[PDB]
């Protein structure tokens, strides 16, 4: 029930997968926003979570896989993945992506940058 | 029930306020994502909508007002505004912001770009 603000910082990024760093920026009662720093050559494995995922690529170049379909993602592109839909990605260059989850993905709250507000 | 993708395009931006252009990128069952292009000197007036608003500043420099708090926002900063909370902003330089609303703000679906494909 309280609003928060997060300043851009290259620190407090926690390791999630080989070449993938994660950091929860802000969250509320219905959303949660994370930032992914993905190195060239890394990938996100296939997952199905009960959270809708809408994202935005800040920089870089990735390939997003939804079901069996593939789409090349560049700076400025966006996407929206519904609940329980198979999705994975392959990172072609050093990329940065912002991802929002609905509802509040409580397992990602532990990735808070500790600063916030 | 359909996933979607939107390609970056400098077109399909509709005017919302003097100096403020809006474009709905994608939306789903619980969220809706828009992109705001804000000219230098413009501002967003005070509003209270029944939608949680979490945003990210792609570029520029603005001053975000949430309730009684004031904060200067620069590139890379983010925020989260709860439902029915007073908020407004003053745009200091040519800025671009991405904003997500929860639940799906159906009134902003009319700003959807033509370049959004399904799956
Ligand atoms: Cu996911
Ligand atoms: Cu608002």
Which CATH number do you get for residue A26?
2.60.120.10
Tell whether A29 lies on the interface with B, counting CB pairs under 8 A.
Answer: yes
Q: Report CA(A46)–ligand 2 centroid distance (Å).
A: 34
Which value, to the nearest 10 degrees, does the dihedral of the CA atoms of residues A66, A68, A69, A71 take? 60
In chain B, residues 59-78 whose CB comes closer than 8 Å to chain A: 64, 66-67, 69, 71, 73-78
| B72 within a domain of the structure (yes/no) | yes
> Which experimental approach was used here?
X-ray
Let me know if residue B21 belongs to a domain.
Answer: no
Q: In terms of Cα–Cα distance, which of B28, B45, B37 is closest to B101?
A: B28
Among candidates A7, A75, A82 on the partner chain, residue whose Cβ is nearest the Cβ of B77: A7
Residues 6+ apart with CB under 8 A from B17: B42, B44, B45
Alpha-carbon B5 to chain mean position: 17
Q: Which two tokens stand for residue B1?
A: 């029930």
Which tokens is A63 given? 């390939």
Residues in chain B: 119
| Residue range of the domain that includes A50 | 20-111
Beta strands in B1-119 (DSSP E): 4-6, 14-17, 20-27, 32-38, 43-47, 52-59, 61-66, 69-74, 78-81, 87-91, 95-102, 116-118
Question: Do the domain assignments include residue A4?
Answer: no
Residue B8 CB: number of other CB atoms within 10 A? 16
Please tell me the distance from the alpha carbon of residue A78 to that of residue A69, in angstroms, as a whole number.
Answer: 16
**To which residue do tokens 């230098």 refer?**
B40
Q: Does the CA dihedral B20-A1-A24-A9 come out positive or negative? A: positive
Of the partner residues B67, B74, B100, the one whose CB lies closest to the CB of residue A8: B74
A31 vs B8: CB contact, 8 Å cut-off?
no
User: b or e along B41-52 (b: 16 or more beta carbons within 10 Å of the residue's beta carbon)?
Assistant: ebbbeeeeeebb
Q: What separation in angstroms does the CA of A84 have from each of A47, A51, A87, B117, B118?
A: 8, 7, 9, 20, 17
Q: Which residues contact A37 (CB under 8 A, 6 or more apart)?
A: A13, A20, A21, A22, A23, A95, A96
- Alpha-carbon distance of A55 to A105, in angstroms, equals 14
Quote the number of domains for chain A: 1
Strand partners, A95: A38
- The answer to whether residue B51 sits within a structural domain is yes
Write down the residue that tokens 């999705």 correspond to. A87
- A75: CA distance to ligand 2 center in Å? 25
């Amino acid at each position: 029930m309280a609003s928060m603000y997060a300043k851009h910082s290259a620190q407090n990024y926690q390791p999630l997968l080989p070449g993938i760093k994660i950091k929860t920026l802000v969250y509320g009662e219905l959303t949660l926003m994370t930032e992914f720093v993905m190195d060239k050559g890394s990938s996100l494995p296939d997952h199905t979570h009960p959270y809708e995922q809408t994202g935005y690529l800040v920089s870089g170049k990735i390939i997003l896989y939804i079901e069996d379909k593939k789409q090349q993602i560049m700076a400025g592109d966006s996407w929206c993945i519904p609940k329980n839909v198979h999705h994975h990605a392959e990172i072609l260059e050093n990329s940065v992506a912002v991802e929002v989850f609905a509802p509040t993905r409580e397992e990602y709250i532990k990735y808070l940058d500790r600063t916030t507000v």
